[PDB]
Write a protein that holds these residues in place. Structure first.
Motif, short mmCIF file in Angstrom:
data_model
loop_
_atom_site.label_atom_id
_atom_site.label_comp_id
_atom_site.label_asym_id
_atom_site.label_seq_id
_atom_site.Cartn_x
_atom_site.Cartn_y
_atom_site.Cartn_z
N UNK A 83 -51.69 -5.26 27.01
CA UNK A 83 -51.10 -6.32 26.23
C UNK A 83 -51.92 -7.59 26.13
N UNK A 84 -53.16 -7.57 26.59
CA UNK A 84 -54.01 -8.75 26.50
C UNK A 84 -54.51 -8.94 25.07
N UNK B 249 -65.29 -14.09 15.21
CA UNK B 249 -66.42 -14.82 14.67
C UNK B 249 -67.04 -15.68 15.76
N UNK B 250 -68.21 -16.24 15.46
CA UNK B 250 -68.97 -16.95 16.48
C UNK B 250 -68.26 -18.23 16.94
N UNK B 251 -67.57 -18.91 16.03
CA UNK B 251 -66.79 -20.08 16.43
C UNK B 251 -65.58 -19.68 17.26
N UNK B 252 -64.97 -18.53 16.95
CA UNK B 252 -63.78 -18.07 17.68
C UNK B 252 -64.09 -17.62 19.10
N UNK B 253 -65.36 -17.35 19.41
CA UNK B 253 -65.74 -16.91 20.75
C UNK B 253 -65.45 -17.99 21.78
N UNK B 254 -65.56 -19.26 21.39
CA UNK B 254 -65.37 -20.39 22.29
C UNK B 254 -63.94 -20.57 22.77
N UNK B 255 -62.98 -19.83 22.22
CA UNK B 255 -61.57 -19.97 22.59
C UNK B 255 -61.09 -18.89 23.55
N UNK B 256 -61.99 -18.13 24.16
CA UNK B 256 -61.61 -17.04 25.04
C UNK B 256 -61.60 -17.49 26.50
N UNK B 257 -60.88 -16.74 27.33
CA UNK B 257 -60.54 -17.15 28.68
C UNK B 257 -61.38 -16.49 29.77
N UNK C 180 -60.04 -11.02 37.58
CA UNK C 180 -60.30 -12.12 36.65
C UNK C 180 -59.98 -11.72 35.22
N UNK C 181 -60.23 -10.46 34.85
CA UNK C 181 -60.00 -10.02 33.48
C UNK C 181 -58.52 -9.79 33.20
N UNK C 182 -57.78 -9.28 34.18
CA UNK C 182 -56.36 -9.00 33.98
C UNK C 182 -55.54 -10.28 33.93
N UNK C 183 -55.98 -11.32 34.61
CA UNK C 183 -55.30 -12.60 34.57
C UNK C 183 -55.66 -13.49 33.42
N UNK C 184 -56.48 -13.01 32.49
CA UNK C 184 -56.93 -13.80 31.35
C UNK C 184 -56.06 -13.50 30.14
N UNK C 185 -55.64 -14.56 29.44
CA UNK C 185 -54.87 -14.37 28.22
C UNK C 185 -55.75 -13.83 27.09
N UNK C 186 -57.00 -14.28 27.01
CA UNK C 186 -57.93 -13.85 25.98
C UNK C 186 -59.24 -13.42 26.61
#
Ligand SMILES: CCCCCCCCCCC1=C(C)C(=O)C(OC)=C(OC)C1=O
Ligand code: SF4
Ligand code: SF4
Ligand code: SF4
Ligand code: SF4
Ligand code: FES
Ligand SMILES: [Ca+2]
Lengths: 198, 905, 588
Positions: free
Chosen positions: B523-524, B364-372, B488-494
């Motif tokens: 596994x990301x 959801x749009x609020x959940x987008x702000x929690x990505x890495x 940068x993408x592989x080192x991101x948790x989210x």
């Protein structure tokens, strides 16, 4: 300009028939017998107009019949409660022609401040009204002003002289509104007395 | 954590500060400079409480509740005498320079400063000296500026600069001459500048579009609705007075669009108030345009349709689920056509297949702000899905948030967080045909044609997972940039992958799906977001149907002799000449719409449909959430001659009259039940909102505030007799104040936020479970599908690189927030904000053609020559020409097409 | 400690007596600003608690009020039992000069309470109204029919889910109700109204309404007659129901004041006074002394106006038609002063939360002095011309007599109660609005409440009000006409016109409404026709959650059949003329 009931029509008015109609209208407008009907606080102001300080008897409008058969004017002076509305309609139906109606006060005009579950929003929902008086309550002289307005309206209406000869339709004058008549003298007001004095 | 406020014990979150903890408990602390979305700065000094060291303490100390953590075993007092005196003194200091402006101020009755002045109990003025004044600025057509009313709370600059990423607003000057505005007169350049009218607690920044036809908040009729201007699905509160849509306020949704809209959704509503809208059904007989009522229109349409041999229906992504379904049931499933083009439909169905079969969660749009880390492929998010761009900016600042959290700095201490994470930010990689508005925070921006962006995505997916198809022919510099993105993408948790259908390329969506699958295989916790075009694009894609080209083929071949077009102008999805020819050949055209479109000249019948403000329905946003929008006002309350019904009501009544020769209109929940019975994929729309029998302790939900005025005079000029109150048989809301809008009422649909003592948008605090969180009894809206158990396969078809061919110009889409959406162009306030339409050219191509900047060039598309001025786009790749999608004469279907004979006029 | 402070009243001896009799866990004491102990009793112990209060050494002898409340939307119910609905019982002990409010909590499905009619007979009409407006059933009630709405009415108007506004008018329903009006004389069943022996073959039936040519209003009484004797009579009321309490839930605290005017429409500022005092208790406002004197002056002017109308209409009902003209001339003198001060005659709406609307205009003392010089000779002339007439005395003396016990058991207040020798005036027993600073007497009777005794008591009350007005004229404090409280609604107008914080306070007070913190308040005053009271429940909003208006005319009209049974119909007319009621007070 007249309104017909049996239609927006013109003046139907021999010169002797016009004089007879004028005499009948003069006698009717100078002898108006209201029905003694108390609904609410507006009736208190109406009977205040009947007392000595105002003396509505001067206009020949004091007889105040307790029977609808002997009354020529119904003053709805108060709220039209839903339990009282059939009573008002029955008392109006028991009145005889010619009969006139004055709504006195905001309640009888439109329901007033009582836009509520138990109140009919104005007496003109179910019975026809000739003169409306704004106020809550209108002062006794406002009722007398409405009585004079009703006299002016009666004085140039057309009704049959007899029920066996002539037109039986009732012609009511399409008056100029009092608002548009008084607009010239009301807008010209500039200064009023300040509310800090007596 | 355990706190003791005024001798009462409470359990709170220890990560919160004292102000939000106490506001979540229903306690009233005055505050100005704190906002739930912006954090704490301790500027206004209004939120003072008295903190004691222990339980047996009499002196205490005045502290800022917004700057004080709500730790375990805290002891504070709000109603302490000294704290009350200090809060009253702060309000008094703010009142010394405040102008005598409340009667002529648009914030009056909706003003946070008014509410806090009343709340502190300050009504006596002893200041007798002069008040400072300020000149105002021209801030553009949307925001009105009045700096006299400023209390220097710094919320505008904090939101606009730190949150929204804007650059043209700032604070200037000094001690008490602090000025908040632009360095010079001009339009505010941020796409989210409209949120200043709710962020500012005073009347400095006001809605100019509302200020034209101004009315107070208590006089509005509100409804919970969904913004219709793109696919994001932001929750809105439209408010109406005297039969016209007066304002769009933000309706809080803790899952979608919490405190903020974009400017297109906030100011693009003016098409509802257009005077050329159809208000009655009109039948064309020769050159005459007779006006029918609803029953005559239904009978005549039913007779003519019953005489026809095959009637087809053309839906639209503008229309709701119920109206599209009603058209589909009227004409039959085999005769129903989605009104979009074949390529647009293919891209939309691919995006839907990725979303509900790819096995990757869509946020959801609020959940987008929690990505890495964020990779945007093809989609110009700021111009097409703007609120997603705002959420992406928050996700980018998440790195400074984490860095400050590593140093035991609380999340509300925003100044310390920004000081620690100076310029470090989470990785953002955006690809487009040209520069974007996210380039200032992007770690990398790739300006390339859509084939090259798709190839970059496929190469990223192959470098993340070697099972993905490889890309042959990558330059070593582009390979190094690809390796930077992959590291940068592989080192991101989210990681989050954002694409959409606006790029006009199937391969871009395929590449984004491949990147998401490659990240999922490692596994990301990868998320994927597809941005669709219109408010109900995803609902029309789920419902399905033929393309517009098939419908035009059926009309042109004569197999269909009747067409019903639902809320579709048909020129944005097909060439205008073909549409006009096919509609002129058809012996019956019936257009059900609320806007005066160009195809109504060929229409034999026009049904005056309702817009979103006059209709109820369901729309499915880009994440697959079904959301109900409710009717704001009755169009027939003032103009009794207006026959403007819901589109599903029109089509259901037409179907009933076609079948049984009798008119049955419908009820809305009946159509909802028909949708969930006939289309099982749309079965979730039943739970988007409760049915019309829903009550709060027996009473309905009020549409207008308790102090709604003028009820015996608003229609008194038409007749002194008050009309019958408009009945709402469709929904649980009532067209009156005789209903419930309590903050504690067990419901999720909130028409507007008001609480006693809180008249401003801060009443949403009273409507939440915790301040800045969700609504108290859940956010409205239900996701239609869950994350799939298994994913898709890798898309093998890697496109070749872009080759500039001679005489052909690839059309690069340029989207504009003010001008690309169809209905928002019709809003008169957007014309002053809409840019003049040019054509974008590479410097090399413009030099080859001998054209400069500003000269007029003419090009023919579908045998129609049109002329446009030229700007020189440095970032645009040669062999491409850039066109503004969705403008007048330029359909969005032109994206990815080619151009012939483009030459100087 | 101020008088508006929230108190539990645990120091009241009745709380200790109830604790000793029923146990500490048998009830819950609620802290309010009503000024009375509020005790939540279990439903199964209500009759026991009522009997115990009835048999106290200084017993609670009067059921002052009985009504209901819809608690379903009430958010601030801290310290309260779980309740979807509630029924409250306000009981007064005159020997203790105390009162207690019992409260019974009711679930939504189980909306039945034992009847209170075996302990207090005025609970009949009170429980009929509670059933009519809230749907609460009272078990054991002799006839639980609707008393405000007609019998064929759907729903209960004072419930929170009932829409307050007027429905669409239909001529079909009017014609149907007319048909029931015409068929009521044929389909009259003498068991629905609570009577028995419906035609001993000589008991005729009479109807006296609903077209009454008098100032007290129009209402039906159906009379069972043995010749000229009244065997039984039930009054049909509710023909003047305006939904005033429901409107109390639909208007702000400030914008409701004109509706308080029209409860007892001969009272005016007297009707405004308990409402604004109760709102000021909710707001925590103590008005200055000049406000107290101004409100006392206007209350006594309107009391003299109402008493003049009452005495003149009683004299007219006896048969002397002349003194009503002079009495209305005196009413015009009063109206000259009232028009000068407030700008209006009958419904001034001049009292405010925290004070009055304006200051006194310059020159008011001349008008007050002129009226005070005018009044006494006119009053003495009315006495000698009509009130000492032996024909009037023969029409009035001994007619519809009752004693102290009958007045107590029916909730009779005002001159009807004090003519039985019970000295209970609120202006002395429970002083309000600075009435302690005035020297006046309370006239009491010898022990019998006749029509003539009530009329002479009202004449003496008029003279005492003239004394209060003389003291008001001589001693006017110099000071503010509005309190300095932040919740004073509206603020002083000049500061609104030139100060921004005052303008903000005014802007929010007149538009959204003043915010009263969640509490319950109660104010009881001596109105022109008895004891009037406002019981206000605030849920923390700008509107009243519940506005309960106790009026004395309701109790007097209910007392009618116990006092007129066995008399003639002319005696019934004289009794109606001497009650001092208006039907807006009864129905409201
Ligand atoms: C046309 C001949 C009339 C003769 C006298 C009629 C009776 C006396 C005047 C009318 C009247 C009645 C009946 C009356 O009852 C009354 O009291 C309410 C009055 O005062 C307002 C009256 O003026
Ligand atoms: S208009 Fe006013 S004064 Fe007249 S009956 Fe209605 S409430 Fe009473
Ligand atoms: S910003 Fe608020 S306090 Fe200031 S003038 Fe506007 S409404 Fe009044
Ligand atoms: S303009 Fe508004 S938001 Fe900005 S500092 Fe001033 S009061 Fe605060
Ligand atoms: S982002 Fe889209 S849905 Fe949200 S306000 Fe803007 S146009 Fe409307
Ligand atoms: S809200 Fe805490 S100082 Fe401003
Ligand atoms: Ca509807």
């Amino acid at each position: 300009d007249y309104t017909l009931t049996r239609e927006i029509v013109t003046d139907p008015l021999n010169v002797f028939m016009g004089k007879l109609n004028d005499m009948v209208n003069w006698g009717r407008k100078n002898s108006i017998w209201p029905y003694n009907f108390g609904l609410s606080c507006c009736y208190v102001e109406m009977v205040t107009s009947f007392t000595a300080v105002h003396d509505v008897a001067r206009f020949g409008a004091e007889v105040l019949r307790a029977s609808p058969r002997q009354a020529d004017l119904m003053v709805v002076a108060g709220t039209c409660f839903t339990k009282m509305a059939p009573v008002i309609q029955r008392l109006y139906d028991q009145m005889l022609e010619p009969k006139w109606v004055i709504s006195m006060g905001a309640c009888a005009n439109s329901g007033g401040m009582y836009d509520i579950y138990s109140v009919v929003q104005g007496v003109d929902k179910f019975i026809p009204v000739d003169v409306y008086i704004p106020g809550c309550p209108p002062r006794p002289e406002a009722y007398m002003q409405a009585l004079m307005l009703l006299q002016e309206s009666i004085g140039k209406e057309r009704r049959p002289l007899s029920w066996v000869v002539g037109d039986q339709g009732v012609y009511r004058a399409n008056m100029q509104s009092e608002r548009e008549r008084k607009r010239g003298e009301r807008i010209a007001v500039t200064n009023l007395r300040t509310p800090d004095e007596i | 954590a355990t706190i003791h406020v005024d001798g009462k014990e409470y359990e709170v979150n220890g990560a919160d500060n004292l102000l939000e903890a106490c506001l979540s408990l229903g306690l009233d602390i005055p505050y100005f400079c704190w906002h739930p979305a912006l954090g704490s700065v301790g500027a206004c000094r209004q939120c003072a409480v008295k903190q004691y060291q222990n339980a047996e303490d009499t002196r205490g100390r005045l502290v800022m509740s917004c700057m004080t953590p709500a730790s375990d075993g805290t002891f504070i007092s709000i109603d302490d005498e000294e704290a009350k005196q200090f809060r009253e003194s702060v309000v008094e200091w703010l009142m010394t320079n405040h102008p005598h402006d409340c009667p002529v101020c648009e914030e009056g009755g909706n003003c946070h400063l008014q509410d806090m002045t009343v709340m502190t109990g300050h009504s006596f003025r002893r200041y007798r000296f002069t008040k400072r004044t300020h000149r105002n600025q021209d801030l553009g057509p949307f925001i009105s500026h009045e700096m006299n009313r400023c209390i220097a709370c710094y919320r505008c600059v904090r939101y606009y600069k730190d949150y929204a990423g804007g650059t043209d607003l700032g604070v200037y000057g000094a001690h008490d001459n602090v000025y908040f505005g632009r360095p010079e007169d001009g339009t505010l350049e941020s796409e989210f500048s409209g949120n200043l009218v709710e962020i500012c607690p005073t009347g400095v920044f006001t809605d100019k579009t509302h200020s034209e036809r101004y009315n107070r908040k208590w006089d509005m009729q509100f409804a919970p609705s969904i913004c219709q201007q793109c696919s994001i699905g932001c929750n809105i509160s439209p408010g109406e007075r005297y039969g016209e849509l007066r304002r769009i306020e933000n309706r809080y949704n803790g899952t979608v669009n919490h405190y903020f809209l974009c400017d297109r959704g906030r100011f693009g509503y003016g098409y509802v108030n257009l005077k050329d809208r159809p208000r009655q059904p009109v039948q064309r007989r020769g050159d005459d345009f007779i006006t029918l009522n609803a029953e005559q229109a239904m009978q005549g349409a039913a007779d003519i349709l019953r005489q026809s041999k095959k009637v087809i229906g053309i839906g639209s992504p503008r229309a709701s689920v119920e109206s599209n379904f009603a058209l589909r049931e009227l004409v039959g499933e085999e005769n129903f056509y989605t009104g979009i083009a074949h390529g647009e439909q293919e891209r939309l169905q691919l995006a839907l297949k990725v979303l509900r079969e790819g096995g990757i969660y869509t946020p959801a749009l609020r959940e987008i702000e929690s990505y890495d880390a964020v990779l945007v492929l093809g989609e110009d998010v700021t111009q097409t899905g703007a609120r997603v761009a705002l959420a992406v900016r928050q996700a980018v600042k998440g790195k400074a948030r984490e860095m400050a959290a590593a140093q035991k700095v609380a999340d509300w201490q925003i100044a310390a967080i920004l000081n620690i994470g100076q310029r470090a930010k989470h990785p953002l990689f955006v690809t487009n045909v040209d520069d974007t508005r996210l380039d200032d925070i992007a770690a990398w921006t790739y300006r390339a044609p859509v084939e090259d962006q798709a190839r970059l995505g496929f190469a990223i997916a192959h470098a993340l997972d070697n099972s993905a198809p490889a890309v042959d022919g990558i330059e070593p510099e582009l390979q190094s940039k690809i390796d930077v993105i992959v590291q940068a993408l592989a080192g991101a948790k989210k990681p989050l992958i954002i694409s959409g259908t606006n790029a006009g390329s199937l391969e871009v969506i395929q590449a984004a799906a491949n990147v998401a699958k490659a990240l999922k295989g490692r596994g990301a916790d990868v998320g994927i977001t597809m941005i669709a075009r219109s408010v109900n694009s995803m609902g029309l894609g789920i419902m399905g149907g033929g393309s517009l080209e098939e419908a035009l083929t059926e009309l042109e071949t004569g197999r269909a002799d009747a067409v019903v077009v639902l809320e579709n102008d048909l020129h944005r999805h097909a060439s205008a000449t073909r549409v006009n020819a096919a509609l002129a050949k058809a012996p019956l055209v019936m257009v059900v719409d609320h806007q005066r479109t160009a195809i109504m000249e060929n229409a034999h019948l026009v049904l005056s449909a309702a817009s979103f403000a006059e209709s109820d329905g369901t729309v499915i946003n880009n994440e697959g959430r079904a959301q109900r929008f409710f009717q704001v006002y009755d169009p027939a309350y003032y103009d009794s001659k207006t026959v403007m019904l819901e589109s599903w009501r029109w089509l259901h009544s037409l179907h009933s009259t076609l079948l049984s020769r009798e008119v049955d209109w419908t009820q809305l929940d009946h159509v909802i039940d028909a949708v969930v019975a006939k289309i099982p994929e749309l079965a979730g729309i039943k739970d988007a909102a409760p049915d019309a029998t829903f009550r709060i302790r027996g009473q309905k939900l009020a549409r207008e505030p308790h102090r709604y005025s003028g009820r015996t005079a608003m229609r008194a000029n038409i007749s002194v007799h008050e009309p019958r109150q408009p009945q709402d048989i469709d929904t649980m809301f009532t067209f009156s104040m005789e209903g419930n809008n309590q903050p504690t009422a067990h419901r999720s649909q909130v028409p507007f936020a008001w609480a006693p003592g809180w008249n401003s948008p801060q009443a949403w605090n009273k409507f939440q479970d915790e301040v800045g969180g969700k609504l108290r009894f859940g956010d409205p809206g239900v996701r239609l599908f869950e994350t799939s158990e298994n994913g898709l396969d890798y898309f093998t078809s890697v496109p070749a690189r872009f080759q500039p061919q001679d005489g052909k110009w690839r059309i690069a889409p340029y989207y504009h927030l003010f001008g690309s959406d169809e209905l928002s162009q019709r809003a008169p306030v957007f014309q002053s904000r809409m840019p003049q339409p040019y054509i974008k050219l590479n410097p090399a191509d413009a030099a080859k053609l001998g054209v400069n900047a500003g000269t007029r060039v003419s090009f023919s598309y579908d045998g129609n020559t049109v002329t446009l001025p030229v700007e020189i786009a440095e970032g645009l790749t040669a062999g491409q020409v850039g066109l503004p999608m969705g403008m007048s004469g330029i359909a969005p279907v032109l994206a990815g097409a080619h151009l012939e004979d483009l030459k100087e006029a | 400690e101020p008088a508006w402070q929230t108190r539990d009243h645990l120091d009241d001896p009745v709380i200790g007596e109830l604790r000793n009799r029923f146990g500490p866990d048998a009830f819950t004491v609620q802290a309010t600003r009503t000024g009375v102990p509020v005790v939540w009793i279990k439903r199964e112990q209500l009759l026991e608690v009522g009997d115990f209060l009835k048999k106290l050494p200084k017993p609670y002898v009067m059921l002052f009020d009985l009504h209901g409340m819809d608690e379903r939307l009430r958010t601030h119910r801290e310290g309260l039992p779980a309740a979807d609905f509630s029924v409250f019982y306000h009981l007064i002990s005159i020997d203790r000069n105390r009162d207690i409010m019992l409260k019974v909590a009711l679930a939504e499905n189980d909306l039945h309470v034992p009847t209170f009619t075996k302990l207090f007979p005025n609970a009949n009409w009170y429980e009929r109204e509670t059933w009519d407006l809230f749907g609460i059933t009272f078990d054991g009630h002799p006839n639980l029919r609707r008393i405000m709405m007609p019998q064929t009415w759907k729903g209960h108007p004072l419930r929170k889910d009932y829409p307050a506004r007027a429905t669409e008018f239909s001529p079909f329903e009017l014609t149907k109700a007319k048909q029931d009006l015409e068929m009521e004389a044929l389909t009259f069943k003498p068991e629905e109204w609570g009577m028995k022996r419906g035609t001993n073959e000589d008991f005729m039936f009479l109807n006296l309404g609903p077209n009454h040519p008098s100032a007290h209003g129009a209402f039906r009484i159906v009379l069972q007659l043995d010749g000229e004797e009244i065997v039984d009579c039930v009054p049909d009321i509710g023909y003047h129901h305006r939904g005033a309490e429901k409107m109390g839930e639909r208007q702000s605290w400030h914008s409701y004041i004109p509706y308080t005017d029209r409860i007892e429409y001969l009272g005016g500022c007297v009707n405004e006074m308990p409402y604004v005092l109760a709102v000021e208790k909710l707001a925590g406002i103590t008005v200055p002394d000049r406000v107290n004197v101004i409100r006392v002056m206007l209350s006594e002017l309107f009391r003299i106006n109402s008493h003049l109308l009452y005495i003149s209409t009683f004299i007219q009902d006896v048969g002397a038609m002349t003194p009503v003209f002079f009495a209305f001339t005196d009413r015009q003198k009063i109206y000259d002063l009232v028009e000068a001060i407030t700008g209006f005659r009958m419904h001034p709406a001049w009292f405010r939360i925290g004070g009055v609307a304006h200051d006194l205009p310059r020159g008011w003392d001349r008008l007050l002095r002129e009226f005070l010089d005018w009044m006494p000779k006119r009053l003495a002339s009315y006495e000698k011309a009509a009130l000492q007439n032996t024909i009037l005395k023969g029409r009035s003396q001994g007619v519809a007599a009752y004693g102290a016990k009958e007045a107590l058991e029916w909730g009779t207040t005002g001159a009807g109660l004090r003519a039985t020798g019970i000295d209970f005036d609120v202006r002395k027993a429970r002083p309000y609005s600075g009435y302690e600073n005035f020297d006046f007497e309370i006239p009491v009777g010898g022990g019998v409440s006749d029509c003539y005794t009530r009329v002479m008591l009202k004449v003496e009350e008029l003279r005492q009000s003239l004394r209060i007005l003389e003291q008001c004229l001589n001693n006017m404090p110099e000071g503010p006409f509005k309190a300095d409280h932040p919740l004073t609604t509206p603020p002083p107008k000049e500061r609104t016109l030139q100060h921004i914080e005052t303008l903000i306070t005014h802007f929010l007070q007149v538009s959204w409404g003043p915010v009263m913190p969640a509490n319950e308040s109660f104010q009881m005053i001596e109105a022109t026709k008895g004891i009037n009271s406002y019981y206000l429940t605030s849920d923390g909003s700008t509107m009243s959650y519940r506005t309960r208006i106790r009026t004395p005319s309701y109790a007097h009209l209910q007392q009618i059949p116990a006092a007129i049974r066995g008399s003639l119909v002319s005696d019934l007319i004289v009794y109606l003329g001497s009650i001092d009621f208006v039907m807006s007070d009864v129905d409201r």
